[PDB]
Design a protein around this ligand. Sequence first.
Ligand code: ADP
Ligand code: MG
Length: 273
Amino acid sequence: LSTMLVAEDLSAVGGISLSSALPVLTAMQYDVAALPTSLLSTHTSGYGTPAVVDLSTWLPQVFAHWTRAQLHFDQALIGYVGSVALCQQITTYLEQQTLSLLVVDPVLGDLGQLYQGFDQDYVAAMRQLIQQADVILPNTTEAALLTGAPYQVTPDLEVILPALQAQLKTGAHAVITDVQRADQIGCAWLDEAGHVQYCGARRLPGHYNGTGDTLAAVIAGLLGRGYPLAPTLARANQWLNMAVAETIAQNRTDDRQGVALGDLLQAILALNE
Ligand SMILES: Nc1ncnc2c1ncn2[C@@H]1O[C@H](COP(=O)(O)OP(=O)(O)O)[C@@H](O)[C@H]1O
Ligand SMILES: [Mg+2]
């Protein structure tokens, strides 16, 4: 079984980030190396101020250990990192690897603004991290921050997509992930001919934690199994829609918990056969 490094935050309570990546990627037939970039009592939306461990001095030791133990990784998914130093540490470790797949979710902001504690220093560190990525999955706010364009609710995909590509290696893909078209929500990217493609599914009411994390985990898992980008995005969006639908069907009293994974895990097992 292939090995997938996943580096992102772990919140003990919340059902998002590394806690949701582990079940998904394990079900998708990877041996997951689950590396917290931060450790939190709960995620940061709705439980009050969480108790957090700073892992900035641990990760360097982790990479040094794996290096000496002669561990090698097939594929990697990098999610929320959270500090300039950790971005830089991850960037150089990954450069030491021969990765067949690197997916970066360049978590930086939403609704037109940087997340709290993130400033243009973090933006620069992210631009360095994405340099070897095969695929990046910014939202519309993150795309604008990376290129340095002023935020637009509806940027010109014909302008912003080439601008983003200009920072990636030849053959890599910038996929913008929360693009709305009429009643749809989905992903937009440039095909090999340079034409903007859109892949979406009918938007469901409400807002749900962990959707981007699970989308990234599914995209990484599919690409890692050799599925071309377009059918990968088609399936990820279908799966993304199905998980949100199951979440709604649970009639939850607690709106903080991340998207349900049961129907998604069932779909994965069916794909495996
Ligand atoms: N309300 C919703 N209805 C249907 N699908 C959704 C909804 N919210 C998110 N999704 C799906 O999950 C994907 C990831 O959402 P995105 O906005 O990128 O996540 P995040 O805010 O967590 O980064 C979207 O592309 C879409 O596929
Ligand atoms: Mg996202």
